[PDB]
């Protein structure tokens, strides 16, 4: 099957009904960190979290920064946008900080209790009407109701397809964020500008030429 490395052997725990049935498996586990079932399940959830968060972040970086290259939508650099926003704001940053901590903490605790017991927050009467749709959809990391409103989880055909594309694009978004911050440390410039420069001359616009990544040269 599609392997992260042909010829090489497949990790046993990765070569399992659950794992190969999880998503996007390629036998990629050199250090063998998901031999425990609970562990690999936790890591699957973790990878999901990171995928989605990174997708969101890279979108919020590029699209506004992309259209600021366009005439409209004058937005600052992403890293300075924090300063820009706290300037243009009204509430103190520590305040709004603590508030959003409360907010995220509650729902994160929800996700937590549900991972502990899939039928945990379905506890009837615990909320007024939540429990009904607040139950999982038999796949931890795939809730229902408000989650998937349009009802795209019902058609099994495109199911694994959505899944594979999800995990793919999420990992790629992680990598995108990493490249952005890395070239912000090295080049110090916005990623769009880094791209423009590498377009103007790839032969001389690269980490090979930065003398930063590879200083021994």
């Amino acid at each position: 099957r599609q392997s992260w490395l042909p010829g090489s052997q497949i990790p046993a725990h990765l070569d399992t009904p659950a794992a190969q049935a999880l998503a996007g498996n390629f036998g990629f586990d050199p250090l063998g960190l998901g031999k425990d079932p609970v562990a690999l399940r936790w890591y699957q959830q973790a990878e999901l979290i990171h995928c989605r968060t990174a997708m969101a972040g890279v979108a919020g970086i590029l699209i506004p920064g992309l259209l600021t290259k366009a005439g409209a939508l004058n937005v600052p650099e992403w890293y300075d946008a924090g300063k820009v926003a706290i300037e243009n704001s009204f509430a103190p940053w520590g305040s709004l900080l603590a508030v959003q901590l409360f907010l995220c903490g509650f729902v994160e605790a929800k996700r937590w209790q549900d991972i502990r017991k899939p039928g945990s927050q379905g506890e009837p009467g615990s909320f007024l009407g939540f429990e009904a749709s607040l139950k999982g959809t038999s796949e931890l990391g795939y809730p229902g109701g408000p989650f998937d409103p349009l009802g795209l989880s019902k058609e099994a055909d495109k199911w694994a397809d959505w899944k594979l594309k999800e995990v793919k694009n999420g990992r790629l978004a992680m990598l995108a964020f990493l490249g952005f911050v890395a070239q912000k440390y090295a080049t110090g410039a916005g990623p769009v500008d880094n791209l423009a420069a590498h377009l103007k001359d790839p032969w001389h616009v690269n980490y090979a030429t930065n003398g930063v990544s590879l200083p021994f040269l």
Partner: protein, 75 residues
Amino acid sequence: TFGFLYVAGYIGYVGRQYLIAVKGEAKPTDKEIIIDVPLATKLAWQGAGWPLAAVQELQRGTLLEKEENITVSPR
């Protein structure tokens, strides 16, 4: 201090890894003297995730030996 503790836990963990691997053998003394070069290299490569592995085994409580080790007669 942080770098020190990192490398130290790494080395200790991989030591116990090889130790368990060779305790799972029929010639414990002979593997204690002559070593399995490739298994050593493998555990060395894998030993980076020693802290995450250890905390996993703790949450599973599989690190420590149960109350069956030899005791002295007066305990």
